[PDB]
Amino acid sequence: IVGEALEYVNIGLSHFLALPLAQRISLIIIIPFIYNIVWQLLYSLRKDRPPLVFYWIPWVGSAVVYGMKPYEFFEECQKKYGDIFSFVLLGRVMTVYLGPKGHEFVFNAKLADVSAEAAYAHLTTPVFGKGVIYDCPNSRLMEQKKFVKGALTKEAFKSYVPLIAEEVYKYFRDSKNFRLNERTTGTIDVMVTQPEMTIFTASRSLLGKEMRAKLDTDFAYLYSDLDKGFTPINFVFPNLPLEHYRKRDHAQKAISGTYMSLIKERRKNNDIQDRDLIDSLMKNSTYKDGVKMTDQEIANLLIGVLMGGQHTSAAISAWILLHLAERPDVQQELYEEQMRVLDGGKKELTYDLLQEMPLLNQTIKETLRMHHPLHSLFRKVMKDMHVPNTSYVIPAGYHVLVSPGYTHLRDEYFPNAHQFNIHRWNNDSASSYSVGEEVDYGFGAISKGVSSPYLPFGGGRHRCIGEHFAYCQLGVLMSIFIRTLKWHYPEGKTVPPPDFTSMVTLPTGPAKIIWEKRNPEQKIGGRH
């Protein structure tokens, strides 16, 4: 008889509940540890699942090693398992597909298979505001991107270039980090200067003179507050009721309120031209179904676009300065190009002349290769996905992770990948180009194939639309840097390792360089 055994289950249960709370919590801690270990061993026996990276701590998973050094994590996993593997990340299962076929599998995934907004809305929506980017169906995002692109034309860039140039010179003249009329040499932290230069140039051109003017006041602190809400922390804790979450929410309201004030002021004055992105969205933000974006949604879209372009661009210009700091040969080569294209500096820089500066553009291109701002891009898996030429199935509820920035740094696709070499792009200085067929998801024709090992701007429906603005901004900025200054490292200093813990792969600061005026007695005009 096992009825007696059934009695002892009950008895055993009663004795369990009567254990000392020392052993009890000890069991509360050890019982999931064992189950988690057991479950993994069972999981590895499945062959319709990609290999899963082993981990000791339940829920946490490989979060530590991935959070701190994701490319080293990927390389070890790649050696062990190949290009497709999964790992647990703070409650989630992430399936990584490394390499060009991984680019295809994720970036060109069917709309019904994966969702970007399901992965990102929790973070971005509190920062940008409601109704836009990832707080809306994909079809709305497609048209929002179309609206923004309408202010990102060649004719717009022709107008932006002198505005951006003005801001760079103003910064050289007025910022305490330079003061070129008073000082001929100095030391700067590029992680201090580049965010400032980036927001000043982007505000002036995209938002206009009024909004740029606000950055000279205490209002600028709000952008810094809003900046704090844009952090990997908010992927896990999007809202816990403490301080920087409040200042974030406050900043969003305060900043969007300022934009709406200008929007409403321009319309009631009929003061709507073709100056900036605000004018453009005011004249062009009606969806195809006839629903118009509200002034709040327009304001929120402005925040998201400026914020995203802020962090990517500021990281890159910082990396460009840092790589050139130990390459006076490259500075010299870029300077000669400036002298030739701008006729010894007597030609005023224009958007057209920027396109005649291949080495400068190649420098941006090579920096984008070595320092892709976003080391990982996510999608939540919505339907079971079969991985082609495998028996692998990625079940709904998983997340897929694609990492073009990892491939950027592989010798197989870029010889001597860890060497900064702008000449690997000789006769290939364009920001990007489709090697064949195109397709339109609602914001213009783009590459249908996403198999390039070089994808600084992603691909597919979620592809970047700011690439030409970024090159314009970076180009003007670096053209002026090169013509005005020489710079180098403090003794014993070199290019710093990336900080993979922030939203973008910015350099580990403080990252200091020493600048010197090429023309010590050159003065920058204007009142101050």
Ligand X SMILES: OC(Cn1cncn1)(Cn1cncn1)c1ccc(F)cc1F
Q: Token pair for residue 468? A: 């030409």
Interatomic CA distance for residues 85 and 41, integer angstroms: 15
Distance (Å, rounded) from C-alpha 147 to C-alpha 144?
Answer: 5
Residue 382 DSSP SS3: coil
Contact between 115 and 382 (Cβ < 8 Å): yes
With CB cut-offs between 5 and 8 Å by kind, which of ligand X, ligand HEM, none does residue 207 bind? none
Q: Looking at the chain, how many residues does it have?
A: 528
Based on the shown chain and the rule CB under 6 A, indicate whether residue 373 belongs to the binding site for ligand HEM: yes
Q: Binding to ligand HEM by residue 256, rule CB under 6 A?
A: no
Which residues, listed in sequence order, are joined to residue 487 by a DSSP beta bridge? Answer: 515
Any binding-site annotation on 462?
A: yes
116 forms part of the interface with ligand X (CB under 6 A): no
CB of 372 to ligand HEM, least distance (A): 7
- Smallest separation (angstroms) from ligand HEM to the CB of 205: 10
Distance CA 97, CA 103 (A): 8
Omega of the bond prior to 510 within 30 degrees of 0, cis? Answer: yes
CA gap 436, 286 in Å, rounded? 32
Question: Of residues 470, 472, 485, 511, which one binds ligand HEM by CB under 6 A?
Answer: 470
CB-based contacts of 337, cutoff 8 Å, min separation 6: 357, 358, 359, 360
CA-derived radius of gyration, the chain = 26
Residue 293 in the binding site for ligand X (CB under 6 A): no
What is the C-alpha to C-alpha distance for residues 361 and 364, in angstroms, rounded to an integer? 5
Structure tokens at 133: 């980017």
Chain centroid offset of residue 417 CA = 21
Q: Are strands 385-386 and 393-394 parallel, antiparallel or unpaired?
A: antiparallel
- Minimum separation from the CB atom of position 151 to ligand HEM (A): 9
Under the criterion CB under 6 A, does residue 194 sit at the interface with ligand HEM?
no
Position among 52, 368, 464, 480 found at the interface with ligand X (CB under 6 A)? 464
Q: CA-CA distance, 54 to 62, in Å (whole number)?
A: 8
Q: Does 157 bind ligand HEM (CB under 6 A)?
A: no
Q: Looking at beta carbons only, is 52 or 472 nearer to ligand HEM?
A: 472
Determine, following the binding rule CB under 6 A, whether residue 305 of this chain makes contact with ligand X.
Answer: yes
How many Cα neighbours within 13 Å face the side chain of 206?
26
Binding-residue pattern over the window 419 to 458 for ligand HEM, x denoting contact by CB under 6 A: -------------------------------------xxx
Give residue number: closest CB to ligand HEM.
466
**Interface pattern 124-143 for ligand HEM (x via CB under 6 A):** -----------------x--
Q: Is 77 annotated as ligand-binding? A: no
- Contact partner, 456, from ligand HEM, ligand X, none, Cβ < 5-8 Å per class: ligand HEM
Q: Is 503 in the site for ligand X (CB under 6 A)?
A: yes
Asked if 312 is part of the footprint of ligand X (rule: CB under 6 A), the reply reads: yes
Residue 313 binds ligand HEM, judged by CB under 6 A: yes
Judged by beta carbon distances under 5 to 8 A according to partner kind, the member of ligand X, ligand HEM, none in contact with residue 100 is none
Closest CB to ligand HEM among residues 49, 145: 145
Contact status, residue 320 vs residue 198, Cβ threshold 8 Å: no
The answer to whether 379 is annotated as binding is yes
Q: Which of 70, 99, 308, 496 binds ligand HEM (CB under 6 A)?
A: 308
Q: How many degrees, rounded to 5, is the angle at CA 215 between CA 214 and CA 221?
A: 110
The binding site for ligand X (CB under 6 A) comprises 133, 304-305, 307-309, 312, 374, 464, 466, 503
Binding residues, as ranges, are 120, 134, 145, 379, 462, 464
